[PDB]
Amino acid sequence: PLESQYQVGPLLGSGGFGSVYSGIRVSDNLPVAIKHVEKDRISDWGELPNGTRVPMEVVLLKKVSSGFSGVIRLLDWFERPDSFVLILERPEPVQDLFDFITERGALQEELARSFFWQVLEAVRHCHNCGVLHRDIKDENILIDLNRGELKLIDFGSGALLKDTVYTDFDGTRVYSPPEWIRYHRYHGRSAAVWSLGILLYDMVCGDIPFEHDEEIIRGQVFFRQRVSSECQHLIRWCLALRPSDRPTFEEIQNHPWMQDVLLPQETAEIHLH
Numbered sequence: 001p002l003e004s005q006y007q008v009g010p011l012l013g014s015g016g017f018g019s020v021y022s023g024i025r026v027s028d029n030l031p032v033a034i035k036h037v038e039k040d041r042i043s044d045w046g047e048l049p050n051g052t053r054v055p056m057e058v059v060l061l062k063k064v065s066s067g068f069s070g071v072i073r074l075l076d077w078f079e080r081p082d083s084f085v086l087i088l089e090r091p092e093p094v095q096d097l098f099d100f101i102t103e104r105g106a107l108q109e110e111l112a113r114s115f116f117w118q119v120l121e122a123v124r125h126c127h128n129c130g131v132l133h134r135d136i137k138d139e140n141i142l143i144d145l146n147r148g149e150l151k152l153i154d155f156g157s158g159a160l161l162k163d164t165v166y167t168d169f170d171g172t173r174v175y176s177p178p179e180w181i182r183y184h185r186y187h188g189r190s191a192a193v194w195s196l197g198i199l200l201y202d203m204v205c206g207d208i209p210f211e212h213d214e215e216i217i218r219g220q221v222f223f224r225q226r227v228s229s230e231c232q233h234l235i236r237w238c239l240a241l242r243p244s245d246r247p248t249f250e251e252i253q254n255h256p257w258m259q260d261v262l263l264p265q266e267t268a269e270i271h272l273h
Ligand SMILES: O=C1c2c(O)ccc(O)c2C(=O)c2c(NCCNCCO)ccc(NCCNCCO)c21
Pocket: 012, 013, 014, 017, 020, 033, 035, 072, 088, 089, 090, 091, 094, 095, 096, 097, 099, 100, 135, 139, 140, 142, 153, 154, 172
């Protein structure tokens, strides 16, 4: 039922997470992405309502895929003998935020404020649906080039949101909070806020702030680019060393720098058309 309902196009990516292909649904020609994950490499399983044994990513994608948001939706999934196959939305034309920043260098503040805000909305929606992504970064963000809408993509290192400590981490190191580096333990919200601080610095600086553990643990932030007294403050607050000194989502979104965000459409008009 799988290779009959969907027509595979070119490979889009591959790596730790598996392989992703461009796809068309025959039913009607909606762009889709086809994500192959091999059973052997799944470290983390869950179970759906009806109680089947699936990869966590599927559990998580299902909890966030209801209604609209800034998260790319799971349209359907299939099991095979050595792999799971996931059918997801595909914006058209699309480019990931990594390449986007790579191409234009640092982003104008107005453009960063728009993008960052949309990320905030997406992460809120996930936190809301009891999901924690745990790997927010430029390359897990797709941009729908036409509508100026951002979308989150890879739940592979995700986990259900819970209020107790986490002692496993699979996201990228350079993006991991100092409490992880030092103690091999973190809480979800505050660690998300840290990575959001990394994401924001990246957007405005062209680059990430820290590379090596000692730089992460030190937590000192240098700007290689002109950035407003105020973005610098928000970035620094997100990257506070002590988790409890970081802002909540709400405080981020009420930050002076987050005022008068653009809508995605006008963002595209001004910065993508
Ligand atoms: O295109 C997707 C994609 C999609 O279109 C719809 C849903 C999805 O879940 C994906 C997707 O997961 C994807 C890639 N996997 C995530 C890489 N994460 C690295 C872990 O740190 C890795 C690469 C990838 N290709 C994006 C296109 N990149 C070139 C233009 O920037 C994708």
